[PDB]
Design a protein around this ligand. Structure first.
Ligand SMILES: Cc1ccc(NC(=O)[C@@H]2CCCO2)nc1
Ligand SMILES: [Zn+2]
Length: 140
């Protein structure tokens, strides 16, 4: 589990979104495994605006933060999970690092702030749904 709290927005894995998230929907995209809902309070997260390929991610199944190199956001074929058949998971970044299904929601961060959240994890290893293209997260 995990979310990004930026301004009055909550960014979660679409497959972990709650009823309250869907009842307060701002934007969702199945292809990206992302959903954004509204919050009453303002959030303490700075989204990165950058093309970094190095950062650190939180891995709940290790209680550890790991430094990683990651690929730029792309349309990877992702192998079937419980929540998606496979499709081309878009805006996905892959690193070499451990992950399990429950690790979805761990922040990846660079020197500029939050890059994305764990979403996928194949043999390739850990995939992070990028949020850095979502400029609108910073305004209104
Ligand atoms: C971070 C992450 C996300 C998903 C997965 N696992 C899968 O997609 C499938 C489900 C059944 C066995 O593997 N592993 C890691
Ligand atoms: Zn950066």
């Amino acid at each position: 589990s995990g979310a990004i709290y930026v301004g009055n927005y909550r960014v979660v894995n679409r497959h972990l979104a709650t009823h309250n998230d869907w009842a307060n929907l701002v934007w969702e995209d199945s292809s990206r495994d992302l959903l954004v809902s509204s919050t009453t309070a303002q959030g303490c997260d700075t989204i990165a605006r950058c093309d970094c390929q190095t950062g650190v991610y939180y891995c709940s199944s290790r209680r550890k933060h790991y430094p990683v190199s990651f690929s730029k956001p792309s349309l990877i074929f992702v192998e079937a999970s419980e929540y998606y058949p496979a499709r081309y998971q878009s805006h996905l970044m892959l690193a070499v690092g451990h992950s399990e299904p429950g690790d979805c929601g761990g922040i990846l961060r660079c020197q500029h702030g939050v890059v994305g959240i764990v979403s996928t994890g194949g043999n390739g290893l850990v995939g992070f749904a990028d949020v850095r293209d979502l400029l609108w997260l910073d305004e209104e």
